[PDB]
Amino acid sequence: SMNPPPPETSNPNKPKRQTNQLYLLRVVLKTLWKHQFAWPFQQPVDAVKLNLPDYYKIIKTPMDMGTIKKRLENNYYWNAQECIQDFNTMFTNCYIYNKPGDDIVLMAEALEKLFLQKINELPTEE
Numbered sequence: 001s002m003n004p005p006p007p008e009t010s011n012p013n014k015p016k017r018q019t020n021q022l023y024l025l026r027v028v029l030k031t032l033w034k035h036q037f038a039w040p041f042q043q044p045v046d047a048v049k050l051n052l053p054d055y056y057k058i059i060k061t062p063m064d065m066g067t068i069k070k071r072l073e074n075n076y077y078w079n080a081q082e083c084i085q086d087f088n089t090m091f092t093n094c095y096i097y098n099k100p101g102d103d104i105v106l107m108a109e110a111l112e113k114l115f116l117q118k119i120n121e122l123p124t125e126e
């Protein structure tokens with residue numbers, strides 16, 4: 001099958017801004033990205049190349065760390081809640097598509113545990 005176009009990372013009609021919490025790029029994203037389990041989550045799923053049939057019939061809100069990184073770099077998010085939701089969509093997609101206890105699920109759970117540790121230390125708005 002064909003892959004869908006990836007999620008937008010910038011939009012000329014959506015207001016842009018930078019906040020000190022959007023920490024999410026320099027601390028949270030970077031800490032997850034360097035983890036040895038991060039690589040399957042760093043780019044959109046290519047369903048044919050990864051042999052994942054049926055993926056985009058099941059997952060209609062795909063999300064990956066590469067998209068989140070680029071959204072942050074482009075000032076796409078207005079607030080931390082929008083960015084956190086994308087991380088959580090990424091984890092949830094993995095838990096929905098794959099079977100419980102699969103290696104990829106255990107990898108996502110380890111990244112999610114680390115994510116929550118970093119979110120716990122999200123700074124107050126300046």
Ligand SMILES: CCn1cnc2c1c(=O)[nH]c(=O)n2CC1CCC(CNS(=O)(=O)c2ccc(OC3CCOCC3)c(F)c2)CC1
Nearest residue numbers: 037039040041045050052093094097098103104106107110
């Ligand atoms: C997220 C989108 N996405 C991308 N690829 C996807 C998916 C998707 O949604 N489902 C998919 O199936 N795939 C294909 C996969 C399936 C599996 C996979 C792991 N291979 S691995 O990095 O060599 C590896 C690592 C850790 C291991 O064990 C530890 C032991 C302690 O707990 C944690 C697990 C281990 F045994 C093997 C890599 C791609």
